[PDB]
Amino acid sequence: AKVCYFTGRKTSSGNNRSHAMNSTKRTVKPNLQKVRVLIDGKPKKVWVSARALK
Amino acid sequence: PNVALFKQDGTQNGEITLNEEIFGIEPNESVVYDAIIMQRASLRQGTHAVKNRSAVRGGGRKPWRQKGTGRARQGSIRSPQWRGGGVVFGPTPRSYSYKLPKKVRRLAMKSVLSDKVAENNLVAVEGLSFDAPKTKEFKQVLANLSIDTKVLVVLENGNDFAALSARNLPNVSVVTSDNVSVLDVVSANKVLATQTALTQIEEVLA
Amino acid sequence: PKQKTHRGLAKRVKRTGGGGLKRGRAFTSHRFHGKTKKQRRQLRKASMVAKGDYKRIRQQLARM
Amino acid sequence: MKLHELKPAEGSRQVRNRVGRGTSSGNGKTAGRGQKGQKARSGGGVRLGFEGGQTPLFRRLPKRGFTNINRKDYAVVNLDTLNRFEDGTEVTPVVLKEAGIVKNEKAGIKVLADGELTKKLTVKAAKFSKSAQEAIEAAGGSIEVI
RNA sequence: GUAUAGUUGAAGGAUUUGGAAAAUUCCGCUAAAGAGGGUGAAAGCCCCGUAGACGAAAUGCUGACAACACCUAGGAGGAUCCUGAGUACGGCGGAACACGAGAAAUUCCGUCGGAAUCCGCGGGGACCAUCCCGCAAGGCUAAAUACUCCCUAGUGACCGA
RNA sequence: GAAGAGACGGAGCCGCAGCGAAAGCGAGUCUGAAUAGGGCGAAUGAGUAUGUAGUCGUAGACCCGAAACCAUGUGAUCUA
To answer: Which residues form the Large ribosomal subunit protein uL15/eL18 domain (chain D) (predicted)?
Structure first.
């Protein structure tokens, strides 16, 4: 689940606060799904974001 | 005030009147003093530097242990008490130059020139030209006017044949009517000038 | 650089024309039922500088 | 005056202190600082305005006021400046000025009323005071808020 | 035109102290050259040079103008058509803006909801009405600015084991 | 312009008017029913540009000295 074949969605990081503003480091990852799609006529399996399945 | 006129040796034509707002103005002294110091102190390059404890290419571990050796405590090889250490408060590259208000600069120039008028040290020529750069003839010209000490020559514009014949003994130095500074004038004893160089001074200084 | 002037004093103190500073007095935000009525009249009116405490502060308020 | 006989202006170039250079100069062995304590360490001294842990002066007295967002304030010239414009000029907040009377007119020239005028001018401005009109027109001049 | 080898380039003798003179003393000369370095001790006239004038078969580099490649038009009409989509924007969680969720626009990122088409859309520090200023979601773009491993030519009230 | 004196350049800054949180008023203003009293001002009371010296602030800031903390790397030829 590394990148998107279509859009540019990929993992990153950011803070995490809790009710008195202490900060730790997260990993905010995209939703990703393995879908069988058609690359150039040949069927392929690739990671595709749930946003671009509309 | 007035100064007589000499040709090349053709002596005593008429005289020239000069401005009594430039050449008669009862010179100050402390202004001239500070102008000389500010001019001469502006000539420096500040280029000089010294490495210190962070730039001396050494090491960054304590040489020893803190106790057990029975010994004074040291934390780095290179630090100012050692030989070959950094230097505390070394000299660094700086500026040295500064400027004054505009009134005192012109007050200084007017003061110096009225001073050298007041001791008969301007010797005024009608015109000066040579067909070719001959340094011998210029020496004969200064022999005509009876000048022996340190001297100044002031020109109009590109009189190349009156400039190229003055790479003499350093009694002689060459200025146009533009670059007449303060340290150019005060270091000399007598000043030569044409008629029109004086008038172009009287246009600039006003 | 420049002296960064303090902002705790910029929000509490104004400068008059003689050189001193106006100061809004204390004890004006609270249990007024404890204090009497001279004490809540006479602590309405702002006052001036005590000369000793104009010594350590004067350089902080270099311009405002 | 020439190069080898320079004289400075008297009382006008001092010498220095060189501190920590011998016991009989006056300032050797602790350099004008004295015995122990944190004023005599390397770079000691507390920050400005500090009374120990006592709450200092700026927390014993309350915050007060605010600042207008559209304060429009003028470039006051009172009246005695006007008394050198002999007879009739259209004294005006524009090209007239030219001699250091008004540099950086802040929001337009206002005219106050201190204190005595014997002229017969005529005035353009942007605001007047209630005694300024009386004092000008007492001498017989025309005023206008333009 | 310039960069990488170069050519020419003026003018002094004798005496005294010296181991050795450029030192000293008489009498001369040159300068578009009196910056510097060396020579048996401190030299304008002993040497290498400096001012000035001259010079490239070969390989670059910079301009100029010829060729060759490109690229670019007016005025009137306003029926119809086109003007960047899972985008703008909203909720929820975080980062950027001087701005720490605060009364918080403007910019992104994650997830879930999800517009209009010139009678249109965005913005003017929550939000509405009026006025004003502008066309997002497709690209490209010299100079003014920062640095010096190095190459050439220099300078310094910088150091002198 | 010679790493320079040496002129052009009036954007900007400071003093010449203050009082009020502010709208504003102005040799006056603020609180106040008040023109009463009081505060701060006013009544002649000069600044500005540069040099230099004393002192302070930001910079390691008068130098030498820790036990420790954090981030890349090197080591199981000694030993478990």
So the answer is: 76-144
> Which residue range forms the structural domain that includes residue B44?
1-206
- The range of the structural domain enclosing residue D111 comes to 75-145
Nearest to B144 by CA among B30, B5, B6, B26: B6
C-alpha separations of B48 from B51, B54, B79, C12 in Å: 11, 18, 21, 49
Give protein residues whose Cβ lies within 7 A of nucleic acid chain E: A 8-10, 12, 14-17, 21, 23, 28-31, 49-51, 54; B 40-41, 43-45, 47-48, 91, 133-136, 139, 164-165, 167-170
Residue D85 identity: F
Q: How far is D66 from chain C (nearest CA, A)?
A: 9
The tokens of C53 are what? 């405490």
| Annotated resolution, angstroms | 3.5
Task: For chain D, give the number of residues.
Answer: 146
CATH number at D97 reads: 3.100.10.10
What residues of D are designated binding site for Mg(2+)?
29
Contact B22, B202 (CB under 8 A): yes
Using an 8 Å CB-CB cutoff, list chain D residues near B29: 1, 7
Cα C48 from Cα C60, distance rounded (Å): 18
CB B189 within 8 A of CB B148: no
Q: Pairing state of beta strands A33-39 and A42-48? A: antiparallel
CB contact under 8 A, B29 and D1: yes
C6, D43, D55, D115 from D52: Cα distances, Å? 18, 18, 8, 53
- For this PDB entry, the determination method is cryo-EM
Q: For CA atoms D97, D103, D108, D114, give the dihedral sign.
A: negative
* Strands annotated E in chain B: 2-6, 15-17, 122-125, 151-154, 174-175, 190-193
B191: burial class by Cβ within 10 Å (0-12, 13-18, 19+)?
Answer: buried
C1' of E129 to CA of B200 (Å): 72
| Euclidean distance between CA atoms B160 and B183, whole angstroms | 24
CA distance linking residue C9 with residue B200, whole number of Å: 60
Those of residues 22-81 in D touching chain B at CB distance below 8 A are: none
Residue D91 DSSP class: B
Neighbours of A13 (CB within 10 A): 10
The answer to whether the CB of B25 falls within 8 A of the CB of B114 is yes
- Contact yes or no for B113/B152 (Cβ under 8 A): no
The Cα–Cα gap between D121 and D137 comes to 9
CA distance C55 to D57: 12
- What is the distance between the alpha carbons of residues B144 and B146, in angstroms, rounded to a whole number? 6
